[model samples]
Target: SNAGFQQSHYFVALYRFKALEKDDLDFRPGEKITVIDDSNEEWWRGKIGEKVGFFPPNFIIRVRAGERVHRVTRSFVGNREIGQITLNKDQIVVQKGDEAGGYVKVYTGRKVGLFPTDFLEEI
Candidate 1:
């Protein structure tokens, strides 16, 4: 029988990247990076070992495509009354709704809350 378990997504660096700024990551080809923030269209923030920084998504290849489960690229603190949820790096949440007001409702553990649509990417 099919289950609802989610998959963890990682990226393989296709080319060597030199960081242009301190906030960017420097990685060699073939390195695997764990996704942290995918809210940006061009650059995504991820961690390579202990280093966390931004990188061009075009230079890396996604390992797998997981369904509605998304990984948080940036940390977000939840706000009460808006139904928002607190999100942090490496935390994956199940999407519970379509995009609205630049945010998406998601489910994690025992709570359902709102998160930025761009802050997440399908694993």
Candidate 2:
């Protein structure tokens, strides 16, 4: 039932296209920004509260207005070889040996956290 789905906690990030590179930044939960692409050098740039940056194509995950969303995982023990490794903005690490499915983590600002993949629809 989706009744508990709505009750579950969720997190949101401002949309940005082609947001790659370590110098690049992420949009806030409710910041306003325009979508722009400059050649191949910059795929998408986001402007949030005086902060503007570009994102790479691989990093962009487009979503609709009423799509489902989930929060990043706080912490979990890795059941595989890679454990506690740092992930990039759009990257996520899934746990091993779990039927419930592994966690999905997102690079939010300067930190990374886990999220559920069920709510994510890759664009």
Candidate with top TM-score is 1
Worst 10 contiguous positions by lDDT, candidate 1: 1-10
**Could you give candidate 1's per-residue lDDT for residues 4-122 as a string of tens digits?**
12115656665678988989899875567777777799888888888889898776655444426667788888786778888776565666788899899886545778999877777
Prediction 1 global C-alpha lDDT: 0.72
* lDDT for each candidate structure: 0.72, 0.40
Task: Give the distance in Å from residue 47's predicted Cα in candidate 2 to where it truly belongs.
Answer: 1.9
Assess the local accuracy of residue 114 in candidate 2 as a C-alpha lDDT between 0 and 100: 45
Over 4 Å off, model 2: 1-34, 38-42, 74-123
- Clashes (candidate 1): 4
Indicate the residue-level lDDT of 16 in model 1. Answer: 78
Q: In model 2, how large is the Cα lDDT of residue 47?
A: 41
Q: After superposition, how far is residue 2 of candidate 2 from its true place, in Å?
A: 38
Give lDDT tens digits, candidate 2, residues 1-123.
443332132223444333356647566433334444334753545444555666543443333454333333333333344333343243332222222354454443444444445443342
How high is the lDDT of residue 36 in model 2? 46
